[PDB]
Design a protein around this nucleic acid. Structure first.
Ligand SMILES: Nc1nc2c(ncn2[C@@H]2O[C@H](COP(=O)(O)OP(=O)(O)NP(=O)(O)O)[C@@H](O)[C@H]2O)c(=O)[nH]1
Ligand SMILES: [Mg+2]
Lengths: 614, 205
RNA sequence: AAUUGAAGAGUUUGAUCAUGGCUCAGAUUGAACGCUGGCGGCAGGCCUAACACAUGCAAGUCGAACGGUAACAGGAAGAAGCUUGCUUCUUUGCUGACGAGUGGCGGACGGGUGAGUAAUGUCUGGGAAACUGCCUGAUGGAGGGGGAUAACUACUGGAAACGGUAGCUAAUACCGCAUAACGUCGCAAGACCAAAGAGGGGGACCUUCGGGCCUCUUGCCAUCGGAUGUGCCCAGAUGGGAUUAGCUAGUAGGUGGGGUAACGGCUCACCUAGGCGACGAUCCCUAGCUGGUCUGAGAGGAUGACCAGCCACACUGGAACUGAGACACGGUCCAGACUCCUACGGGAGGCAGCAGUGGGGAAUAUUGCACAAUGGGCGCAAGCCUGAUGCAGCCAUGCCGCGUGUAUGAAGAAGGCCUUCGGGUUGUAAAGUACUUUCAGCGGGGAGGAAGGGAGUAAAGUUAAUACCUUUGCUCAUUGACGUUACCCGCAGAAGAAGCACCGGCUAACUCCGUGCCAGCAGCCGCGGUAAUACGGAGGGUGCAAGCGUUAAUCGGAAUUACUGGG
RNA sequence: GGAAGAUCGUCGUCUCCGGUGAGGCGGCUGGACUUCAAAUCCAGUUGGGGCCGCCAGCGGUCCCGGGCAGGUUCGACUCCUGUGAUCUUCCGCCA
């Protein structure tokens, strides 16, 4: 129940705070010194009842209003002061429009200066307030007429403070904290105080400070002048933290948050809500909770917009914010973050309807989640950062049927199979380049399909194809079951006329490679694939023999152990007279096959199947 | 800690059969070992004295697969030892438990020996241990844990060990793949091809 | 067995060899910056401002010293509600216990800093003219009295701080008396000096019925020792500067007095005029010293963080007393400055202790836990206290260990790079096949640190006593902050894990593209002027590896201050 | 954060400028340009984005541009009232 008071200067805001408490908001020395709200002052009223209400006095200055925009973050209920003396004012209407754009859940009207002026003036200010409340659509409000000098309003207000529901938020979110006021008490640590927009933190927690980009242990925390071991979001949180970082490095608008941020983004898609129509590509002040910014807006078809900061800044999805004119004064429109890094070329016709599908069709993070998985890989860290997912929230994607989950992005099974089918047709085209092959190798395929796409997602998708049984593989080559190795003609047109000739007698490659005119490396395809047929062998790459010579060379080699009792080379020469060169080459041939072993003078033959069984 | 990289390229930078990996083959050589250690390995640099001695020290440190710092530690302690520095150095360098696991024959590679010792499979003097860098004690038995038994690879490497000839200074009964180290080998009983003194003067700067 | 141990290069010129510096390859660090980062063990973690410090903690403890009951709980008489033996409340130190007060001891140890200090120090090796509480050995004493007072009570001051007036009381508090030599003085003879009791049990035996009595325990006094520690002295050793050569008057001795626990110009009076020194006095500058640490082959050189000892210091300048022990880090008093409160009269405080903040800076930790263990103060003891310590948290800061997978695998793919376009190359690399699950995760099992001590026990000793007390065994239970410990057994899948520098030569490792003495590289000699093996990028290779690289400082190379070891 | 200020052409700097912006200088590019540096003159220094079609963070096309706007005025780089950012200085920096 933080409850901020708001309104124009000298409506008695601080006076109201003394009325309820007799204690004050003003903490900065200059305001003490000058008797004013130079800057946002905070006050808290700890109680035996155990609530501490949070009072926030804010400047009515338009010039200081950008600071008020820093202070309207995290309000649970709002009390807009209106003085019976001065009455309703256009600035009051401005503060109401600003809180309406912030989507502040509820508000209370409190008339002040009642005794100071005659009752007819009281009724006038009453009527003017009753007119003004109807404009922004908030309905219930408890108007209180009182003089603080009289105390008339105390009882009805005190009940009213307790009446307000607290705005609970879901436990499963990464913790996030907006730095506001740095000051270091001499006792232990920095203590940095800020509104916690989401998630939960406790005194033992380590938190990731951005910019310095380092974890920092929490030394202590005080929830709201109510010291405790833990701090929940939705309240200002004094948060004392260990760390090497010091206040001189710290600046307002630095972020404290649970997880290492995605890098700051100038571009952002944002929801437009407007009291009056705006215009494309113009400078304005962006105001988010505890954030004062300047940047230029751009229009994206109709009430869809992209903000372009010239100063990149971290932000996250579904953070409500108000957009004001760059010169200050006029407040013109609200905004909400919807997409944080829209792709370039976003304006082409088919796509905008689909972006509308990503956002208008889906309110829930899960529905937007499914749309993004349908679009392509969802790096869970980024999308999760936009939704501030906790691990229990991370489980929702596992709950989703049909999604192919690699180490990050899911992919829909039917849609996965669709993308597979496209890659398969390309793979069929490679199968057309050589239908004799069972198929393309895997690494060439990964490069051939979608090189930009994630290795975890792609390899897992190939595993899904293996589970389908669509990809059977042998010798490490992955192929479709259907291929019959019909024989591609690019091989065959030389192989047909060459085959009986090379068949019927061995011939060296070059000896009639010139007669065919073929290049040597060009034959280091056709001939090795003929070796894949198992017909023509190669002792050496340049010369190729038919199997039928090699089999005879084997049977004459077989005689060494039987005729000699030794595997001496000499019988190849002692029988048919075959030369030492080609014979030693046959020896390297079986050695590379692993068909025979070398030891000392002679070959061991511990495993070959060719040797006659007896 | 382990080198984690292709093996026979480091082996073929020198063109020798470094036995870093063998498996079904004793050596490949069919990978064009002596010709292309690198992009300019087709031409052979003549390599100055510091480069040849350093290159040999690199080669041997690679065949035993040790990192440079504790390698130099082996050097400095070996110099602290009495007697010939190169000799006792090489002997204690063979004292590494993984090398002993390879020479005992159960192990496809000395790196694989680091694997199997890391997996608790070894059992020395009735106690499990993991440091392959450890130097086996004289006349000390070493055994493999009975749960380590069943892997087919170990014995299949023993059939390779038989072909290797195996060192005589260590006595592996091999009837229970539990061998005993005996004593640190003398320079006379082994190698006579590698030349260890290169390393010691290479550190003598 | 106590060692085993020493390498050069580049650069002067047209070229040579010398002389000679300058530069590099090595090692090391209380390092830093940047890049990078998976885990574990062991270490270390303000060298800057002896600069300024909030808040909390670090020094208390004994009723077995005394008077008491402030608080808590029993018990006691009584209240006597009612739930008629459940509860009601007054009084009750009478018991367990204890606030505060008096008294005993601690607080002079423990820890931090190295400012000062060039000698009042520290080290080595000696010496006489000393003291030493509590521990311990021998030795004897220990009897008999008085007068006070804090606390407390009433009065009263001052904003607070802190008192003040009056009155009451005990003590192992104080002060007397007696007492005494192996004590001190005295050549001697003689003279003179000390005090405390308390606690535990207990038969007989005295009981003003408080107590007395026996016995035991422990305390007190006295004297000589022992150990220990401390003081004092001796000679040498322990930085630089001679563009510092003259220096000193209570300073050099003498007598007497004074003074110290003790020698002594330590001090005073008086006499003498000496006294120091080129073997460097005085003066100036700098500095904590040593064991030791790095480096070196060695000799040397530099250094003296952490560990250990000694000295010196505690915001600054000072001073003195109490005390066995101080001119006293959390004692006192004076002065000053710096901060804080005040009713403005007056007051208060000192992290160079453990944490912590700020500042400085290139820059270095938890306002964490426990006395569980060791150690210490008090206590008979139990226990109390301990930021010593035991630990943990944080950091790749350093050392050490491991992993980021294994084996096989040629259809040696594609891509990249290159090419003579011949083909190489990346590469068994990949894929596949067959394995593996270290550690982490998850789940179990599960040490030693824990010795003692409590209660009781039997027995012994002691004793008038089978008691008490003492000792030895035994039974019971019990003592863990660390600790979800160490360590071990399961689960599942390579699942969670490789970077950084360099590639002209010195110096290991090269091609293309881009650029064109530009932009830029650079420890040194050097490169770049349109085809750069030196710039920038790619590919490839080399070197280190959970680390990698430039800078910071010392030694080494430097035999280039040359005793070893130069002209 | 507050109290004040200056700054943010069109390659840079300047005098500025109420006349359709003008000029000077400097740095570099190209002509003059020397065995090189140097000189003094000339021409120029494409800015920013919007929108569109490619993968081409590029082209094509359009529009605006002296920080961003407005008020003024016949005419604003100019003058004037503000206002944003960076920059400069003092004060403030309380679980
Ligand atoms: N007599 C009387 N005076 C009142 C009453 N309520 C308010 N006031 C007057 O209101 C004046 C204070 O106004 P103030 O609190 O400054 O208004 P603010 O809106 O808080 N100013 P800021 O914008 O700076 O925060 C007081 O001086 C007081 O005299 C009332 O009930 N009676
Ligand atoms: Mg106010």
């Amino acid at each position: 129940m933080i409850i901020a008071t708001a309104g124009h200067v000298d409506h008695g805001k601080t006076t109201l705070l003394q009325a309820i408490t007799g204690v004050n908001a003003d903490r900065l020395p200059e305001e003490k010194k000058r008797g004013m709200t130079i800057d946002l002052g905070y006050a808290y009223w700890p109680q035996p009842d155990g609530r501490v209400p949070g009072f926030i006095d804010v400047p009515g200055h338009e010039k200081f209003l950008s600071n008020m925009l820093a202070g309207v973050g995290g309000i649970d209920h709002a009390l807009l002061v209106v003085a019976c003396d001065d009455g309703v004012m256009a600035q009051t209407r401005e503060h109401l429009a600003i809180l309406q754009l912030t989507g502040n859940p509820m508000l209370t009207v409190a008339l002040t200066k009642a005794d100071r002026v005659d009752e007819a003036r009281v009724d006038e200010v009453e009527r003017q307030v009753k007119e003004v409340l109807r404009e922004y659509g908030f309905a219930e409000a408890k108007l209180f007429i009182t003089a603080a000098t009289e105390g008339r309003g105390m009882d009805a207000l005190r009940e009213h403070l307790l009446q307000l529901p607290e705005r609970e938020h879901a436990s499963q979110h990464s913790f996030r904290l907006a730095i506001d006021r740095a000051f270091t008490v001499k006792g232990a640590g920095l203590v940095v105080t800020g509104t916690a927009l989401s998630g939960e933190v406790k005194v033992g927690d380590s938190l990731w400070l951005t910019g310095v980009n380092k974890p920092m242990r929490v030394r202590a925390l005080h929830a709201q002048n109510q010291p405790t071991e833990t701090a929940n979001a939705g309240q200002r949180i004094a948060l004392n933290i260990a760390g090497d970082a010091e206040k001189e490095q710290i600046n307002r608008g630095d972020w404290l948050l649970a997880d290492v941020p995605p890098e700051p983004f100038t571009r952002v898609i944002v929801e437009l809500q407007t009291h009056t129509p705006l215009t494309q590509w113009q400078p304005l002040h962006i105001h988010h909770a505890a954030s004062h910014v300047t940047g230029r807006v751009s229009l994206l078809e109709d009430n869809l917009a992209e903000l372009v900061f010239d100063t990149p800044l971290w932000l996250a999805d579904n953070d409500r914010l108000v957009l004001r004119d760059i010169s200050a004064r006029n407040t013109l429109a609200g905004a909400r973050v919807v997409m944080l890094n829209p792709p370039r070329r976003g304006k082409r016709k088919p796509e905008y309807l689909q972006w509308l599908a990503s956002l208008a069709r889906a309110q829930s993070d899960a529905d937007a989640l499914s749309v993004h998985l349908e679009r392509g890989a969802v790096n869970l860290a980024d999308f999760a950062w936009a939704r501030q997912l906790n691990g229990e929230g991370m489980r929702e994607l596992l709950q989703q049927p049909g999604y192919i989950q690699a180490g990050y992005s899911l992919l829909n099974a039917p849609v996965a199979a669709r993308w597979q089918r496209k890659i398969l047709d390309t793979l069929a085209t490679y199968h057309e380049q050589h239908r004799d092959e069972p198929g393309p190798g895997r690494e060439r395929l990964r490069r051939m399909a979608l090189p930009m796409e994630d290795e975890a997602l792609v390899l897992l998708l190939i595993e899904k194809m293996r589970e389908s049984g669509d990809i059977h593989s042998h010798h490490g080559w992955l192929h479709l079951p259907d291929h019959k190795a019909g024989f591609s003609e690019e091989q065959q047109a030389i192989w047909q006329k060459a085959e009986p000739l090379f068949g019927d007698e061995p011939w060296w490659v070059r000896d009639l490679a010139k007669e065919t005119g073929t290049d040597e490396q060009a034959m280091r395809l056709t001939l090795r694939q003929a070796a894949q047929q198992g017909i023509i062998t190669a002792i050496v790459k340049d010369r190729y023999y038919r199997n039928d010579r090699i089999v005879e060379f084997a049977n004459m080699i077989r005689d060494l152990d039987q005729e000699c009792g030794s595997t001496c080379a000499a019988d190849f020469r002692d029988r048919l007279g075959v030369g030492r060169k080609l014979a030693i080459q046959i020896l390297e041939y079986f050695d590379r096959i692993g068909f025979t072993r070398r030891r000392g003078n002679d070959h061991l033959l511990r495993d070959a199947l060719l040797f006659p069984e007896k | 800690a382990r080198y984690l990289g292709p093996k026979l390229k480091l082996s073929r930078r020198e063109g020798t059969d470094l036995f870093l990996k063998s498996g079904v083959r004793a050596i490949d050589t069919k990978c064009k070992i002596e010709q292309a250690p690198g992009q300019h390995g087709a031409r052979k640099p003549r390599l100055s004295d510091y480069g040849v001695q350093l290159r040999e020290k690199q080669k041997v440190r690679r065949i035993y697969g040790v990192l440079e710092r504790q390698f130099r530690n082996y050097y400095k302690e070996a110099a602290r030892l009495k007697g010939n520095t190169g000799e006792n150095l090489l002997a204690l360098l063979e004292g590494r438990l993984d090398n002993v696991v390879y020479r005992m024959g159960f192990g496809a590679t000395r790196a694989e020996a680091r694997q199997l010792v890391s997996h608790k499979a070894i059992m020395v003097n009735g106690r499990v241990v993991n440091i392959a860098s450890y130097q086996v004690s004289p006349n000390d038995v070493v055994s493999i844990r009975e749960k380590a038994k069943k892997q087919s690879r170990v014995k299949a490497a023993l059939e390779l060990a038989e072909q290797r000839e195996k060192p005589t200074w260590l006595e592996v009964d091999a009837g229970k793949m539990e061998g005993t180290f005996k004593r640190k080998p003398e320079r006379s009983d082994l190698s006579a091809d590698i030349n260890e003194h290169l390393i010691v003067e290479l550190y003598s700067k």
